[PDB]
């Protein structure tokens, strides 16, 4: 059938998004590995750690970012977490046919 894939916005984030998908699949594990490899080689943090735990304040390449409820909840980290979760989920559900 003719389907629509629609992708959400803010407010969806929490600690531990798609970790069960990372535990189930292998292509999703591969795309998590390429994602956090790319961001620790370019940006200067571990997006796997930013999703898997919610630390108080991390240091980027130059500066440190702080958000007292959790560093998962501010702008850049919410968006890259949503990006890697959507990419991992669609890679898993396209390798499952």
């Amino acid at each position: 059938p003719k389907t629509v894939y629609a992708f959400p916005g803010q407010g969806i984030q929490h600690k531990g998004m798609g970790m069960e998908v990372r535990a189930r699949s292998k292509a999703a594990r591969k795309v998590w590995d390429t994602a956090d490899k790319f961001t620790r080689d370019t940006l200067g943090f571990s997006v796997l750690h930013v999703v898997r735990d919610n630390p108080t304040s991390i240091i980027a390449s130059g500066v440190h970012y702080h958000h007292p409820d959790g560093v998962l909840y501010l702008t850049q980290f919410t968006q890259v977490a949503m990006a890697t979760v959507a990419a991992a989920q669609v890679a898993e559900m396209r390798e499952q046919g």
Binding site: R40, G44, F45, S46, H49, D53, P55, I58, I59, S61
Partner: protein, 40 residues
């Protein structure tokens, strides 16, 4: 070396590219004992 392992471990996943730095002291026979302590 247990100490350097632990102190290197505690700031690992939070702050990458943040490297601990160690200064070893070496204090003739006492210097030989010190170098034997070094080259492990």
């Amino acid at each position: 070396q247990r100490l350097i392992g632990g102190l290197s471990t505690i700031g690992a996943e939070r702050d990458i590219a943040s490297r601990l730095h160690v200064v070893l002291p070496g204090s003739d026979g006492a210097y030989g004992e010190a170098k034997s302590a070094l080259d492990a």
